[PDB]
Design a protein around this ligand. Sequence first.
Ligand code: FNR
Length: 137
Amino acid sequence: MVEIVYWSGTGNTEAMANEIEAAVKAAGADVESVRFEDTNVDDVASKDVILLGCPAMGSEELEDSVVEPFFTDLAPKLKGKKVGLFGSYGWGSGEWMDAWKQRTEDTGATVIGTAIVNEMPDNAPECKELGEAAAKA
Ligand SMILES: Cc1cc2c(cc1C)N(C[C@H](O)[C@H](O)[C@H](O)COP(=O)(O)O)c1[nH]c(=O)[nH]c(=O)c1N2
């Protein structure tokens, strides 16, 4: 059981989440895909595996006004659980995802892969890989 929580500006992370979802469904696993704006730590608690979807913003950062408020709320129950990280970038890779990995790992949770894409999904099999991994917790 996987809660795929995504923040999508320009369709990108939605389509990424959809790709992941298909790989989860292929291995007969229950998926709950929602947006960062409409979720809660209590919901997350019921799912052994969680995936977070945030594109690269400003100067190689996470999306401050939604993802960081939800992350702080999430932190008390982000222990032991399998958390996969998925994001789209334009011109700069890695940094935002490294900082993101560091904070998600740091709460006592483990990272069930990191998917980085050049704007649009499919261009990185990583998305599908994360799907498979999430299906298998
Ligand atoms: C205000 C703003 C700021 C950034 C971006 C876009 C926008 C609109 N993008 C590109 C972005 O990661 C890419 O286009 C995503 O596929 C879509 O991101 P959003 O859904 O538009 O936030 C971007 N890309 C990148 O590689 N490093 C960066 O720091 C940023 N910063």
